[PDB]
Coordinates of C-alpha atoms in Angstrom, one line a residue:
Chain A
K1 CA 0.0 0.0 0.0
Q2 CA 1.5 3.3 -1.1
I3 CA -0.6 5.2 1.4
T4 CA 1.0 3.2 4.3
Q5 CA 4.3 2.5 2.5
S6 CA 4.3 -1.0 3.9
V7 CA 3.6 -4.4 2.6
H8 CA 0.5 -6.4 3.7
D9 CA -0.5 -10.1 3.8
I10 CA -3.9 -10.7 2.1
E11 CA -5.0 -12.8 5.0
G12 CA -5.7 -9.5 6.8
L13 CA -6.9 -7.5 3.8
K14 CA -10.5 -8.7 3.9
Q15 CA -11.9 -5.3 5.1
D16 CA -9.9 -3.2 2.5
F17 CA -11.2 -5.6 -0.2
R18 CA -9.9 -3.3 -3.0
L19 CA -6.8 -1.9 -4.6
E20 CA -6.0 1.6 -5.8
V21 CA -3.8 3.5 -8.3
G22 CA -0.2 3.5 -7.1
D23 CA -0.5 0.1 -5.3
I24 CA 1.8 -2.8 -6.0
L25 CA 0.3 -6.3 -6.1
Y26 CA 2.5 -9.4 -6.0
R27 CA 0.6 -12.1 -8.0
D28 CA 1.3 -15.7 -8.8
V29 CA 3.0 -16.7 -12.0
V30 CA 0.6 -17.6 -14.8
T31 CA 0.8 -19.2 -18.2
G32 CA 2.4 -16.7 -20.6
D33 CA 4.8 -15.1 -18.2
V34 CA 8.4 -14.9 -19.2
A35 CA 11.0 -16.8 -17.0
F36 CA 14.7 -16.9 -17.1
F37 CA 16.1 -20.4 -17.6
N38 CA 19.7 -21.3 -16.7
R39 CA 21.9 -24.3 -16.3
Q40 CA 25.3 -24.3 -14.6
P41 CA 27.9 -24.4 -15.9
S42 CA 27.0 -21.2 -17.9
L43 CA 29.5 -21.4 -20.7
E44 CA 27.6 -20.0 -23.7
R45 CA 25.6 -16.9 -24.4
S46 CA 22.5 -19.1 -24.6
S47 CA 23.1 -20.6 -21.2
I48 CA 20.5 -18.2 -19.9
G49 CA 17.4 -17.8 -22.0
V50 CA 13.9 -16.5 -21.4
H51 CA 11.1 -19.0 -22.0
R52 CA 7.4 -18.5 -21.7
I53 CA 5.9 -20.1 -18.6
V54 CA 3.5 -23.0 -19.0
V55 CA 2.1 -23.8 -15.6
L56 CA 1.4 -27.5 -15.1
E57 CA -1.6 -27.6 -12.7
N58 CA -1.0 -31.3 -11.8
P59 CA 0.4 -31.2 -8.2
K60 CA 2.3 -34.5 -8.6
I61 CA 4.8 -32.9 -11.0
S62 CA 7.7 -31.0 -9.5
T63 CA 10.1 -30.9 -12.5
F64 CA 11.0 -28.3 -15.0
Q65 CA 9.6 -29.4 -18.3
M66 CA 11.1 -28.2 -21.6
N67 CA 11.2 -29.4 -25.2
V68 CA 14.0 -31.8 -26.1
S69 CA 15.0 -29.5 -29.0
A70 CA 15.6 -26.7 -26.4
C71 CA 18.4 -28.7 -24.7
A72 CA 20.9 -27.6 -27.3
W73 CA 20.9 -24.1 -25.8
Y74 CA 21.9 -25.3 -22.3
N75 CA 23.8 -28.4 -23.3
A76 CA 21.5 -30.3 -21.1
Chain B
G1 CA 67.5 -43.1 24.2
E2 CA 64.8 -45.3 25.6
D3 CA 62.5 -42.4 26.4
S4 CA 59.3 -42.2 24.4
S5 CA 57.8 -39.1 26.1
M6 CA 59.5 -36.4 24.1
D7 CA 59.3 -38.2 20.7
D8 CA 58.0 -36.3 17.7
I9 CA 54.4 -37.4 17.7
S10 CA 54.2 -36.6 14.0
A11 CA 56.8 -39.4 13.4
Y12 CA 54.3 -42.1 14.3
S13 CA 52.4 -41.3 11.1
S14 CA 54.5 -43.3 8.7
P15 CA 54.6 -41.5 5.3
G16 CA 52.4 -43.0 2.7
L17 CA 53.7 -41.5 -0.5
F18 CA 57.1 -40.5 -2.0
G19 CA 57.2 -36.7 -2.3
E20 CA 55.6 -35.7 1.0
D21 CA 58.6 -33.3 1.2
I22 CA 58.2 -32.2 -2.4
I23 CA 56.1 -29.0 -2.2
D24 CA 54.8 -26.9 -5.1
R25 CA 51.9 -24.5 -4.8
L26 CA 49.8 -25.3 -7.9
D27 CA 46.1 -25.7 -8.7
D28 CA 44.8 -29.2 -8.4
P29 CA 44.1 -30.3 -12.0
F30 CA 40.7 -31.7 -10.9
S31 CA 39.7 -28.8 -8.7
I32 CA 36.5 -27.1 -9.7
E33 CA 37.7 -23.7 -8.4
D34 CA 37.4 -21.2 -11.3
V35 CA 34.1 -22.8 -12.4
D36 CA 31.3 -21.2 -10.3
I37 CA 28.8 -24.1 -9.9
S38 CA 26.8 -24.9 -6.7
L39 CA 27.2 -28.0 -4.7
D40 CA 23.8 -29.6 -5.5
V41 CA 24.1 -28.8 -9.3
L42 CA 27.4 -30.5 -9.6
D43 CA 25.4 -33.5 -10.9
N44 CA 25.1 -31.5 -14.1
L45 CA 28.7 -32.3 -14.7
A46 CA 28.0 -36.0 -14.5
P47 CA 28.6 -37.6 -17.9
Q48 CA 26.3 -40.1 -19.7
Chain C
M1 CA 24.8 40.3 5.2
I2 CA 22.5 39.0 2.5
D3 CA 24.1 38.2 -0.8
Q4 CA 23.6 36.3 -4.1
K5 CA 25.2 32.8 -4.3
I6 CA 25.2 30.3 -7.2
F7 CA 24.6 26.7 -6.2
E8 CA 25.0 23.4 -8.0
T9 CA 22.6 20.5 -7.3
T10 CA 21.3 17.4 -8.9
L11 CA 17.6 16.9 -8.2
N12 CA 15.6 13.7 -8.0
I13 CA 12.3 13.3 -10.0
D14 CA 9.8 10.8 -8.7
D15 CA 7.6 11.1 -11.9
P16 CA 9.5 12.6 -14.8
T17 CA 6.5 12.5 -17.2
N18 CA 4.5 14.8 -14.8
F19 CA 7.5 17.0 -14.1
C20 CA 8.7 17.6 -17.6
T21 CA 5.3 19.1 -18.6
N22 CA 6.2 22.5 -17.0
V23 CA 9.9 22.0 -16.4
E24 CA 10.8 25.5 -15.2
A25 CA 8.0 26.0 -12.7
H26 CA 8.3 22.4 -11.5
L27 CA 12.0 22.9 -11.0
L28 CA 11.5 26.0 -9.0
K29 CA 8.8 24.2 -6.9
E30 CA 11.2 21.3 -6.2
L31 CA 14.0 23.7 -5.3
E32 CA 11.9 25.7 -2.9
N33 CA 10.9 22.4 -1.2
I34 CA 14.5 21.4 -1.0
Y35 CA 16.7 24.4 -0.3
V36 CA 14.6 27.2 1.0
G37 CA 15.2 27.6 4.7
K38 CA 18.2 25.3 5.1
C39 CA 21.9 25.8 5.5
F40 CA 23.9 24.3 2.6
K41 CA 27.4 24.9 1.3
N42 CA 28.5 27.7 3.6
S43 CA 25.3 29.5 3.0
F44 CA 21.7 29.7 4.2
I45 CA 19.5 30.3 1.1
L46 CA 16.9 32.9 2.2
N47 CA 15.2 33.1 -1.2
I48 CA 15.3 31.2 -4.5
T49 CA 16.1 33.0 -7.7
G50 CA 16.3 32.0 -11.4
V51 CA 18.1 28.9 -12.6
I52 CA 21.3 29.7 -14.6
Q53 CA 21.5 26.2 -16.2
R54 CA 19.7 22.9 -16.1
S55 CA 20.0 19.5 -17.6
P56 CA 17.8 17.1 -19.6
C57 CA 15.8 14.8 -17.5
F58 CA 18.1 11.8 -17.5
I59 CA 16.5 8.5 -16.3
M60 CA 18.4 6.8 -13.5
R61 CA 20.6 4.0 -14.7
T62 CA 21.6 2.0 -11.7
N63 CA 18.1 1.5 -10.4
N64 CA 14.8 0.3 -12.0
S65 CA 12.7 3.0 -10.4
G66 CA 12.0 4.8 -13.7
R67 CA 12.9 8.1 -12.0
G68 CA 14.9 11.0 -13.3
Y69 CA 17.4 13.3 -11.6
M70 CA 18.2 16.5 -13.7
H71 CA 21.1 18.8 -12.7
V72 CA 20.3 22.4 -11.7
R73 CA 22.5 25.5 -11.3
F74 CA 20.5 28.1 -9.5
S75 CA 21.2 31.4 -7.8
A76 CA 19.7 32.0 -4.4
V77 CA 19.9 34.8 -1.7
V78 CA 21.7 33.7 1.4
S79 CA 22.6 35.2 4.8
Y80 CA 26.4 34.9 4.4
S81 CA 33.9 30.7 15.8
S82 CA 33.6 32.5 12.5
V83 CA 30.2 31.0 11.5
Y84 CA 28.7 27.5 11.4
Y85 CA 26.2 26.9 8.7
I86 CA 25.7 23.3 9.7
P87 CA 24.0 21.7 6.7
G88 CA 20.4 20.6 6.9
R89 CA 19.5 23.1 9.7
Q90 CA 17.1 26.0 9.4
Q91 CA 19.3 28.4 11.5
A92 CA 23.0 29.3 11.8
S93 CA 24.9 29.7 15.0
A94 CA 28.3 31.3 15.8
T95 CA 27.9 31.7 19.6
Chain D
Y1 CA 47.3 -18.4 1.9
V2 CA 50.4 -17.3 -0.1
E3 CA 49.9 -15.1 -3.1
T4 CA 51.9 -16.9 -5.7
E5 CA 53.9 -13.9 -6.5
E6 CA 55.0 -13.0 -10.0
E7 CA 54.6 -9.4 -8.5
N8 CA 54.0 -7.7 -11.8
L9 CA 54.6 -4.0 -12.4
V10 CA 52.1 -1.2 -13.1
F11 CA 40.1 18.5 -5.4
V12 CA 38.1 15.3 -5.4
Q13 CA 35.2 17.0 -7.1
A14 CA 35.4 16.7 -10.9
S15 CA 34.8 19.9 -12.8
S16 CA 31.3 20.3 -14.2
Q17 CA 30.8 19.6 -17.9
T18 CA 28.8 21.6 -20.3
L19 CA 26.5 19.4 -22.4
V20 CA 27.3 20.3 -26.0
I21 CA 24.9 18.7 -28.5
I22 CA 26.0 17.8 -32.0
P23 CA 23.8 19.5 -34.6
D24 CA 21.5 17.1 -36.4
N25 CA 23.4 17.5 -39.7
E26 CA 26.7 16.2 -38.1
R27 CA 25.4 13.1 -36.3
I28 CA 27.3 10.0 -37.5
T29 CA 25.6 7.3 -35.3
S30 CA 23.1 5.1 -37.1
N31 CA 19.6 6.5 -37.5
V32 CA 18.1 3.1 -36.4
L33 CA 17.6 2.1 -32.8
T34 CA 19.8 -0.7 -31.6
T35 CA 17.9 -3.6 -30.0
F36 CA 19.5 -2.4 -26.7
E37 CA 18.2 1.1 -27.2
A38 CA 14.8 0.0 -28.1
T39 CA 14.6 -2.4 -25.2
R40 CA 15.8 0.3 -22.8
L41 CA 13.2 2.8 -24.2
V42 CA 10.4 0.2 -23.9
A43 CA 11.5 -0.6 -20.3
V44 CA 11.8 3.0 -19.2
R45 CA 8.4 3.9 -20.6
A46 CA 6.8 0.8 -19.2
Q47 CA 8.1 1.5 -15.7
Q48 CA 7.0 5.2 -16.1
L49 CA 3.5 4.0 -16.9
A50 CA 3.8 1.6 -13.9
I51 CA 4.4 4.6 -11.7
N52 CA 2.3 7.3 -13.4
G53 CA -0.3 5.6 -15.6
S54 CA -1.0 8.3 -18.2
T55 CA -0.9 7.3 -21.8
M56 CA -1.3 8.7 -25.3
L57 CA -2.6 5.5 -27.0
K58 CA -6.1 5.5 -28.5
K59 CA -6.4 1.8 -27.9
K60 CA -6.9 0.4 -24.4
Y61 CA -4.2 -2.0 -23.1
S62 CA -4.2 -3.9 -19.8
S63 CA -0.4 -4.1 -19.4
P64 CA 2.3 -1.4 -19.3
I65 CA 4.7 -3.6 -21.3
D66 CA 2.2 -3.7 -24.1
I67 CA 1.4 0.0 -24.0
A68 CA 5.1 0.9 -24.0
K69 CA 5.9 -1.6 -26.8
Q70 CA 3.0 -0.2 -29.0
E71 CA 4.1 3.4 -28.2
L72 CA 7.5 2.5 -29.6
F73 CA 6.0 0.8 -32.6
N74 CA 3.6 3.7 -33.4
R75 CA 6.4 6.3 -33.1
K76 CA 5.0 8.3 -30.2
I77 CA 7.6 7.5 -27.5
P78 CA 8.1 10.5 -25.2
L79 CA 11.8 9.8 -24.7
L80 CA 14.9 10.9 -26.5
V81 CA 18.0 8.7 -26.9
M82 CA 21.2 10.5 -25.9
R83 CA 24.1 8.8 -27.5
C84 CA 27.4 10.0 -25.9
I85 CA 30.9 9.0 -26.4
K86 CA 33.1 12.0 -25.5
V87 CA 34.2 13.8 -22.4
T88 CA 36.8 16.4 -22.9
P89 CA 39.4 17.3 -20.3
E90 CA 38.1 20.7 -21.1
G91 CA 35.0 19.8 -19.2
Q92 CA 32.5 19.3 -22.1
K93 CA 30.2 16.4 -22.9
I94 CA 29.6 15.8 -26.6
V95 CA 26.3 13.8 -27.2
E96 CA 24.0 13.0 -30.1
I97 CA 20.3 13.4 -29.1
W98 CA 18.1 11.1 -31.3
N99 CA 14.3 11.2 -31.4
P100 CA 13.1 7.6 -31.7
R101 CA 10.0 8.8 -33.5
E102 CA 12.4 9.5 -36.4
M103 CA 14.7 6.5 -36.0
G104 CA 13.9 3.2 -37.5
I105 CA 12.9 0.4 -35.2
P106 CA 14.7 -3.0 -35.0
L107 CA 12.9 -6.3 -35.3
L108 CA 12.0 -7.0 -31.7
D109 CA 10.1 -10.1 -32.9
Chain E
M1 CA 75.0 -15.5 -44.7
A2 CA 73.5 -12.5 -42.9
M3 CA 76.1 -10.2 -44.4
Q4 CA 75.5 -10.7 -48.2
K5 CA 71.7 -10.7 -47.8
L6 CA 72.1 -7.7 -45.6
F7 CA 74.3 -6.0 -48.2
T8 CA 71.6 -6.4 -51.0
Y9 CA 68.6 -5.7 -48.8
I10 CA 70.0 -2.6 -47.1
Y11 CA 70.3 -0.9 -50.5
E12 CA 66.8 -2.2 -51.1
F13 CA 65.8 -0.5 -47.8
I14 CA 67.3 2.8 -48.9
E15 CA 65.5 2.5 -52.2
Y16 CA 62.2 2.0 -50.3
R17 CA 63.0 5.0 -48.1
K18 CA 63.0 7.0 -51.4
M19 CA 66.5 8.2 -50.6
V20 CA 69.4 8.9 -53.0
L21 CA 72.7 7.1 -52.3
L22 CA 75.7 9.4 -51.7
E23 CA 78.5 6.8 -51.4
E24 CA 79.0 4.5 -54.4
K25 CA 78.2 0.8 -53.8
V26 CA 81.3 -1.3 -53.3
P27 CA 81.2 -4.9 -54.4
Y28 CA 80.4 -7.6 -51.9
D29 CA 84.0 -8.8 -51.5
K30 CA 85.3 -5.4 -50.6
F31 CA 82.4 -4.8 -48.2
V32 CA 82.8 -8.1 -46.4
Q33 CA 86.6 -7.8 -46.0
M34 CA 86.2 -4.2 -44.8
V35 CA 83.7 -5.3 -42.2
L36 CA 86.4 -7.4 -40.5
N37 CA 89.1 -4.8 -41.5
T38 CA 87.5 -1.6 -40.0
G39 CA 84.9 -3.3 -37.8
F40 CA 82.0 -1.6 -39.5
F41 CA 80.8 -0.1 -42.8
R42 CA 79.3 3.3 -43.5
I43 CA 76.5 4.0 -46.0
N44 CA 75.3 7.5 -46.6
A45 CA 72.0 8.6 -48.1
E46 CA 70.1 11.8 -48.6
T47 CA 66.4 12.4 -48.1
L48 CA 63.9 14.4 -50.2
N49 CA 64.4 17.1 -47.5
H50 CA 68.1 16.9 -48.6
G51 CA 69.4 15.8 -45.2
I52 CA 72.0 13.1 -44.6
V53 CA 71.1 9.8 -43.1
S54 CA 73.9 7.4 -42.2
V55 CA 74.0 3.6 -41.7
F56 CA 76.5 1.5 -39.7
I57 CA 76.8 -2.3 -40.3
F58 CA 78.7 -3.9 -37.5
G59 CA 80.3 -7.3 -37.7
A60 CA 79.5 -9.8 -35.0
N61 CA 83.1 -10.0 -33.7
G62 CA 83.8 -6.4 -34.7
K63 CA 85.7 -3.8 -32.8
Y64 CA 82.8 -1.6 -31.7
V65 CA 80.4 -4.3 -30.5
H66 CA 82.7 -5.6 -27.8
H67 CA 83.2 -2.6 -25.4
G68 CA 82.0 0.9 -24.6
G69 CA 84.8 3.5 -25.1
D70 CA 85.5 2.5 -28.7
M71 CA 81.8 2.7 -29.5
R72 CA 81.6 6.1 -27.8
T73 CA 84.6 7.4 -29.8
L74 CA 83.1 6.1 -33.1
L75 CA 79.8 7.8 -32.7
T76 CA 81.3 11.0 -31.1
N77 CA 83.6 11.6 -34.1
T78 CA 80.9 10.6 -36.6
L79 CA 78.3 13.0 -35.2
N80 CA 81.0 15.7 -35.4
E81 CA 81.0 15.5 -39.2
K82 CA 79.5 18.6 -40.8
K83 CA 76.3 17.0 -42.0
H84 CA 72.6 17.7 -41.6
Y85 CA 72.3 14.3 -39.9
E86 CA 68.5 13.8 -39.8
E87 CA 68.8 10.1 -38.9
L88 CA 71.6 7.7 -38.0
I89 CA 71.3 3.9 -38.1
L90 CA 73.1 1.1 -36.2
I91 CA 72.9 -2.5 -37.3
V92 CA 74.2 -5.0 -34.7
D93 CA 74.0 -8.7 -34.0
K94 CA 71.0 -9.9 -32.1
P95 CA 72.7 -10.7 -28.7
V96 CA 74.5 -7.4 -29.0
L97 CA 71.1 -5.8 -28.3
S98 CA 71.4 -7.3 -24.8
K99 CA 74.8 -5.7 -24.0
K100 CA 73.5 -2.9 -21.8
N101 CA 76.7 -0.9 -21.9
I102 CA 76.5 -0.2 -25.6
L103 CA 72.9 0.9 -25.3
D104 CA 74.0 3.1 -22.4
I105 CA 76.5 4.8 -24.7
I106 CA 73.9 5.2 -27.5
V107 CA 71.4 6.7 -24.9
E108 CA 73.9 9.1 -23.5
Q109 CA 75.0 10.2 -27.0
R110 CA 71.3 10.7 -28.0
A111 CA 71.1 12.9 -24.9
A112 CA 74.2 14.8 -26.0
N113 CA 72.7 15.5 -29.4
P114 CA 68.9 15.5 -29.2
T115 CA 68.1 17.4 -32.4
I116 CA 68.8 14.3 -34.4
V117 CA 67.5 10.7 -34.0
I118 CA 69.7 7.7 -33.3
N119 CA 68.4 4.1 -33.7
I120 CA 69.9 0.7 -33.3
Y121 CA 68.5 -2.4 -35.1
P122 CA 69.4 -6.1 -35.4
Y123 CA 70.2 -7.8 -38.7
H124 CA 66.9 -9.5 -39.3
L125 CA 65.2 -6.1 -39.9
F126 CA 67.3 -5.8 -43.1
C127 CA 68.0 -9.4 -44.1
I128 CA 64.9 -9.5 -46.4
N129 CA 62.6 -7.1 -48.3
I130 CA 60.3 -6.9 -45.3
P131 CA 57.5 -5.0 -47.1
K132 CA 57.3 -7.9 -49.6
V133 CA 56.8 -10.5 -47.0
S134 CA 53.4 -12.2 -47.3
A135 CA 52.5 -12.2 -43.6
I136 CA 53.3 -8.4 -43.3
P137 CA 50.4 -6.2 -44.5
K138 CA 50.9 -2.9 -46.4
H139 CA 52.0 -0.3 -43.8
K140 CA 52.0 3.3 -44.9
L141 CA 52.5 6.6 -43.0
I142 CA 49.7 9.2 -43.3
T143 CA 50.5 12.9 -43.0
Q144 CA 49.7 14.8 -39.9
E145 CA 46.7 16.7 -41.3
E146 CA 45.1 13.5 -42.7
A147 CA 45.6 11.7 -39.4
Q148 CA 44.3 14.8 -37.6
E149 CA 41.1 14.9 -39.7
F150 CA 40.6 11.2 -39.2
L151 CA 40.9 11.6 -35.4
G152 CA 38.6 14.7 -35.5
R153 CA 35.9 12.7 -37.3
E154 CA 36.3 9.9 -34.7
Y155 CA 36.6 12.3 -31.7
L156 CA 39.8 10.4 -30.8
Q157 CA 42.9 11.5 -29.0
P158 CA 46.1 10.2 -30.6
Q159 CA 46.9 8.0 -27.6
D160 CA 43.5 6.3 -27.8
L161 CA 44.6 4.6 -31.0
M162 CA 46.3 1.2 -31.1
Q163 CA 50.0 1.6 -30.6
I164 CA 52.7 0.3 -32.8
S165 CA 56.4 0.1 -31.7
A166 CA 58.9 2.2 -33.7
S167 CA 61.0 -1.0 -33.7
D168 CA 58.6 -2.8 -35.9
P169 CA 60.1 -3.9 -39.2
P170 CA 57.7 -2.2 -41.6
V171 CA 57.6 1.0 -39.6
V172 CA 61.4 1.2 -39.7
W173 CA 61.3 0.5 -43.4
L174 CA 58.8 3.3 -43.7
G175 CA 61.0 5.6 -41.6
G176 CA 58.2 6.3 -39.2
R177 CA 58.8 8.3 -36.0
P178 CA 57.1 8.4 -32.7
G179 CA 54.1 10.8 -32.9
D180 CA 53.5 9.6 -36.5
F181 CA 50.4 7.7 -37.7
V182 CA 50.7 4.6 -39.8
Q183 CA 47.8 3.2 -41.9
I184 CA 47.7 -0.5 -42.5
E185 CA 45.8 -2.5 -45.1
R186 CA 45.4 -5.8 -43.4
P187 CA 43.8 -8.8 -45.0
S188 CA 40.6 -10.1 -43.4
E189 CA 38.6 -13.3 -43.5
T190 CA 35.4 -11.6 -42.3
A191 CA 35.4 -8.5 -44.5
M192 CA 38.0 -9.2 -47.2
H193 CA 40.7 -6.8 -46.0
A194 CA 40.2 -3.8 -43.8
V195 CA 42.2 -0.6 -42.9
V196 CA 43.4 0.5 -39.5
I197 CA 45.5 3.4 -38.3
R198 CA 48.1 2.9 -35.6
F199 CA 50.0 5.4 -33.4
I200 CA 53.8 5.0 -33.4
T201 CA 55.3 4.8 -29.9
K202 CA 59.0 5.1 -28.9
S203 CA 61.1 2.2 -30.0
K204 CA 61.9 -0.6 -27.5
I205 CA 65.6 -1.2 -26.8

């Protein structure tokens, strides 16, 4: 909140219930967001690339999934 | 000559190699020192 | 004794798009917030006067705030243990 | 720690500089934005919209990155590119001030 | 051997320098026997400015490459000749460049007479037509106003340029001095030859 110049947890923001111009909201990553993708050792210029985020809603999956053709960038 | 109290305690450790006196300050040719890779991601270096 | 003194300063602009609309008046407003009534550089700055020189509104590099700074060279009237214009204070003292 | 020793050989306020601007007929830098300059312009405008919010686009956009990118594409970016490689000991800064609304735009796609 | 190739290619070097020979060219036998006889050999040439440039070819086991006082006497009496003396040239064996006493004499003489330039070179700088070597691009000196306009276009100070030693073979063959600019047409595998301009810095000794 810019008016208070402090950060707030939404668990206690039930009564405010709204945002305003000049407010900063930290929101979860969604499909279509751009994410930096890196593999150590970072030897090449392409070792750090920006991919578009595809969020896998299945909770059983904890890996980073990327196309096999994309491995050549990271030598992975 | 039969006293064992004042013996060099480091002498009991019998040397295990040849050049334990040979000293040269050089980088270990297997040391990952100038490559900046974290401990857990050292598995990336594993061949296949 | 009151006198005219020329000062150098780099401002900080929190919203350069708003500020650059009326650059001169906005600059004088910022300066009278900043320097009027405070000791600074062996001087007290009683009153603000016209700006001799200014700079384009550069956007800060080393931070992502999108803010600008601008450099300003302005003349202002000052009230110049000899004397102690301790900076940041609204009164001098040479007791 | 022993430094392996080859032991090889070899007024704190700088004078102010006057910003001299090369006339538009003597500018030698390319009249097309580099992808670095275009990226910087889009980022600066997008952050400025993030902090201010005013816009000059007749089409509504829900994201500052899109508004800034389209402002760059439609040649109405309210930012000049100052290209500067010179500082003379004489205390003078020689820059070229380029209006991106007149420069060509790189691919960015 | 180094001496015969030196004998032909030194006159080639004077020809490249666009300088007219003063002394008549002796045959090879007389030159080689005189090198052991007198311990050196003197070649005189005149520039387009009409100033005298002298050259000294020293045998490896000559008189003046062994110690200091003899070397000092030779140069002191030679620079006492009534000549314009725009440049003077020494040619000595490659290890002789590492005999610090002789370089001390040459340095102190240069200090004694600063209005003219003294240089010392090994044989290999004159044992081939260096400009015609394949691996060596085409060096050429540009005039002061041309270099100055080049720098003014680029907003460059002369020291911001790449530096070339005055002891380089092609710069010596050009006759370049410190404070002069050399333009080089270097072959390129990315743009099919490209041109650079380098700043000549004092010779290494």
